[PDB]
Amino acid sequence: PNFSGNWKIIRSENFEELLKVLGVNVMLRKIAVAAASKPAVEIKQEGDTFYIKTSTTVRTTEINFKVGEEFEEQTVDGRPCKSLVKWESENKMVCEQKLLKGEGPKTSWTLELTNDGELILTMTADDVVCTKVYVRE
What we know:
This protein is mainly beta. It has a single domain, classed as Calycin beta-barrel core domain (Lipocalin, Beta Barrel). 10% of the residues lie in helices and 55% in strands. It has a 10-stranded antiparallel beta sheet with strand order 4-3-2-1-10-9-8-7-6-5. Strand 3 (49-55) and strand 4 form a beta hairpin. Transports retinoic acid to the nucleus. Regulates the access of retinoic acid to the nuclear retinoic acid receptors.
């Protein structure tokens, strides 16, 4: 299917705790779940090529990738990393991340589209999982 759209968050579970495994301090943490608490997600998909923009009130980031080709982005706590997305199924992609510098938690993310048109994002850091669910504006 097609992941394209302007996506608004409808559910968020365990985000604060993902931030703790990544070692995000309490100052940054409390404002990260506050007004940066509607991240808006915009996706443009063409075949295996993706543009994904994630925005809060104060921050904006863009990634551009093709499935099966390495690219650079950052972990949720901001550390630069090399990423690689592959399809787990027709409706689900999985991204493995590797730090460019230093050591840290094993981090990944997944995106999947339900038959009803919900976008499910999961983010993992070692043994901690955060799930966010979006619907199209």
